[PDB]
Each structure stands twice: as structure tokens, then as C-alpha cells.
Amino acid sequence: QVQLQESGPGLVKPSETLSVTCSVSGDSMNNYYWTWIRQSPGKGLEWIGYISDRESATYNPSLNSRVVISRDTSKNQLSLKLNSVTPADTAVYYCATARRGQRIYGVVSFGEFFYYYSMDVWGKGTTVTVS
Amino acid sequence: QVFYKTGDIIGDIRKAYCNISGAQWHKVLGRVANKLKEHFNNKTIVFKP
Amino acid sequence: VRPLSVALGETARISCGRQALGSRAVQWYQHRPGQAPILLIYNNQDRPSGIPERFSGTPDINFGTRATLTISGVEAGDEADYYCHMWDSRSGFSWSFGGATRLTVLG
Ligand SMILES: *[C@@H]1O[C@H](CO)[C@@H](O[C@@H]2O[C@H](CO)[C@@H](O[C@@H]3O[C@H](CO)[C@@H](O[C@@H]4O[C@H](CO)[C@@H](O)[C@H](O)[C@H]4NC(C)=O)[C@H](O)[C@H]3NC(C)=O)[C@H](O)[C@H]2NC(C)=O)[C@H](O)[C@H]1NC(C)=O
Ligand SMILES: *[C@@H]1O[C@H](CO)[C@@H](O)[C@H](O)[C@H]1NC(C)=O
Ligand SMILES: *[C@@H]1O[C@H](CO)[C@@H](O)[C@H](O)[C@H]1NC(C)=O
């Protein structure tokens, strides 16, 4: 069973590199696509860019590719590096697993499949504020 | 005078297509190839797009 | 964000705020404050493993039908917010979850 524990710095200096990481226990590392969730206070659930098991990371265009993520093979951990942070962006972070599923509504040969992800496991949550 | 134009697609956007069974088409095309061999000196018959 | 009240002891249906532009495969997640949210329905058809049948959704048969989430009465788990995540062909990837819907029960 996955005991999803997130390493929480608690306080991060503004305009500095961040190390916010989630640990995964007793699970295959490349079994599912790896995704992260960050919810600002007084805001709806916001999903930041996910990283594939092929070490290719989708990025939210709003974040301007500030986040850099590289999954650590040894530590079973998803290391997030956030640069030039501000008090606004810092918030609670959630670690999640995404199951890629494709919905086909026509001829696959032409190409009418779109991939939709399902959040099988959700993060416990770690709250980080600027210091 | 009313000019009828295409406004939008309600739903998915899907390419138009025509489906032809491969087995029946290739059977008939083999028959056509033999009949063309009869009139074309038993040469190998090559259909190309 | 405007929460919708739910009748006490009666199952209630919430309609997804955003509208699909094509064939849709919605994702439903029930957020839990201070804990890990639990996914409710995937592909709007079948419940995930370990999830009760209390949550069900409309099929995508035909067009002109809106996806909905079913809940069982009112409880502590039902009180917390849940989200509707629309996946339609035309829009593409759905980066934003969307507006939140919350259950409120009192008296
Ligand atoms: C010509 O030949 C091609 C093959 O070369 C053939 O292509 C097939 O086209 C059909 C549609 O006519 C596709 O079937 C789709 O499959 C999806 C999922 O597999 C199904 O969607 C389910 O049903 C409804 C949606 O309508 C929804 O309530 C339900 O929830 C959906 N399922 C899920 C899990 O969400 C449908 O059966 C259908 N989708 C539609 C109609 O939108 C095949 O996938 C195509 N197969 C290939 C190989 O491309 C085509 O039909 C042929 N055309 C003729 C005229 O003969
Ligand atoms: C075409 O453009 C007009 C105006 O830019 C817009 O109102 C209309 O919805 C568009 N149609 C499609 C199919 O995009
Ligand atoms: C075309 O349609 C007919 C009847 O609708 C069916 O019997 C036949 O198999 C179809 N052919 C293909 C290639 O789908």
C-alpha cells in the first residue's frame, strides 16, 4: 500500500529554489504517470504540470515552466524545483498518481483518441509559506 | 434569395470516410488482375495510386 | 463558487458547471480538507475499486445530456467539496478543475 508522505520544508525564502517532494512506498515507480496538485488558499483545486514516467514533464502555461521535476529512482520521490517563488504561488502541495485512459469516439486510424487522466491516489498535503 | 452556409459542428469533429471490406475487395481485385493478365500477355499486374 | 444544498437523508444530483463541446469522459473527485481526496467516478460509467456504488454518473450515450454526480444523503464525507473535471475532444486537456460544489446540511 502506498503511504504517501510529502517532504515539507515549511518555510521557503522568496525568489529561491524549492525542494518540495512526495515519497512513495511499496509501489512500482513507473506504473503510473506522476502528477502534482497545488491549492492556493481561497481558491479552487489547481493542478500543476505533470511528469510522465518517460521523464517528460507537462507544464502549466501559467507557471511559465518555473517548476522543474525529476523523479529520483533511488528515493521513490518526485523532486520539485521551484524558482523565483512569491508568497502568492506558495501553498499546500499534493502528490497524485494519474492513470492514462484514452477515449475513442470514431476511427482510430484517422486519430480521434484523446487521453484523460484519473487521479487514483491523492496527496495528504504539505503546507509551505514564505519566510 | 437565401444563401445557406455551414455554421458549426454540434458535437465531435469527425473526418468523412468510406468503408470497403478488405477480403471482398482483394478477391475482386485478384479476379480483375487475372482478367488483365489474360489481355496483357500474362504480365504481373500492378495497381498503383 | 456557489455551494448547493442537499436534502437531508435524500440522494441529490449535481450538474457539472462547465459544458462539454463533444464526447465527454468526466473525472469526479471528492476533496477532503486535511486528508487525501478520494476519486468518485472515472469515465462517468464505473466506480473505482474500493469506492461504494453511492456515486454514479450519466452515460455519454447521445449528445444533449449533462453529466451528473450522485451522492447518498448527507454525512461528514459528503459535506466536503467535490469537483467536476470535463474532458471533451474539442477543448483538449483540462488543466483547471473548475468551480467547486459543496454540500451543506444543518438541522
Ligand atoms: C468504418 O470502419 C471503421 C473501422 O475501420 C469503424 O470505426 C469504428 O467506429 C466506431 C463508431 O462508429 C467506433 O466505436 C466507438 O467506440 C467508443 C468506445 O470504444 C464507443 O463509445 C461508447 O458509447 C457511447 C458513445 O457513443 C458512450 O455512452 C459510452 O460511454 C462510450 N464508451 C465509453 C467507454 O465511454 C462507441 O461504440 C463509438 N463511439 C462513438 C460512436 O462516438 C470504433 O471505435 C471505431 N473503430 C475503429 C477501429 O476505428 C467505423 O464505425 C466504420 N463505419 C461504418 C459506417 O461502417
Ligand atoms: C468563426 O469566427 C466567428 C468570429 O471570429 C465566431 O463567432 C464563430 O464562432 C467562428 N466559428 C467557428 C466554427 O469557429
Ligand atoms: C456496410 O454496411 C452493410 C450493411 O449496413 C454491412 O453488411 C457491411 O458489412 C458494411 N461494410 C463495411 C466494410 O463496413
Radius of gyration of chain A, taken over Cα atoms and rounded to an integer in Å: 16 Å
User: What structural class is derived from the secondary structure elements of chain A?
Assistant: mainly beta
Identify the overall geometry of chain A: globular
Number of helices of chain B: 1
> Which strand order do you get reading across the main beta sheet of chain A?
1-3-7-6
Order of helices and strands of chain A: EEEEEEEEEE
Q: What's the Cα radius of gyration of chain B?
A: 21 Å
Largest sheet of chain B: none
Oligomeric status: part of a larger assembly
- Describe the biggest sheet of chain A? 4 strands, antiparallel
- Span between termini of chain B: 43 Å
Q: Compute the separation of the termini of chain A in Å.
A: 35 Å
Structural class of chain B: mainly alpha
| CATH superfamily annotation of chain A | Immunoglobulins
Textual characterization of the structure:
The structure is cut from a larger assembly and holds chains A (131 residues), B (49 residues) and C (107 residues). Chain A is built from no helices and ten strands. Chain A is mainly beta and 131 residues long. Chain B has 49 residues and is mostly helical. Helices cover 37% and strands 0% of the residues of chain B. Chain C is mainly beta. Chain C has a single domain (2-106), classed as Sandwich (Immunoglobulin-like), CATH 2.60.40.10. Chain C has one helix and five strands; from the N terminus they run ββββαβ. Chain C has one helix at residues 76-79, and strands at residues 13-15, 27-30, 38-42, 68-70, 82-85. In chain C, strands 3-2-5 form a three-stranded antiparallel β-sheet, with no helix packed on it. In chain C, strands 1-4 form a two-stranded antiparallel sheet. In chain C, a hairpin with a 7-residue loop joins strand 2 (27-30) and strand 3 (38-42). The radius of gyration of chain C is 14 Å and the shape is globular. Chains in contact: A-B, A-C, B-C. The A-C interface holds A 4, 44-47, 58, 60-61, 94, 99, 101, 103, 105, 112, 114, 116-125 and C 1, 22-23, 25, 27, 29, 31-32, 34-39, 42-43, 48, 83, 87, 89, 92-93, 95-100. The structure holds a molecule of 4 linked components (NAG-NAG-NAG-NAG) and 2-acetamido-2-deoxy-beta-D-glucopyranose (2 copies). Chain B: Belongs to the HIV-1 env protein family. Chain B: This is Envelope glycoprotein gp160.
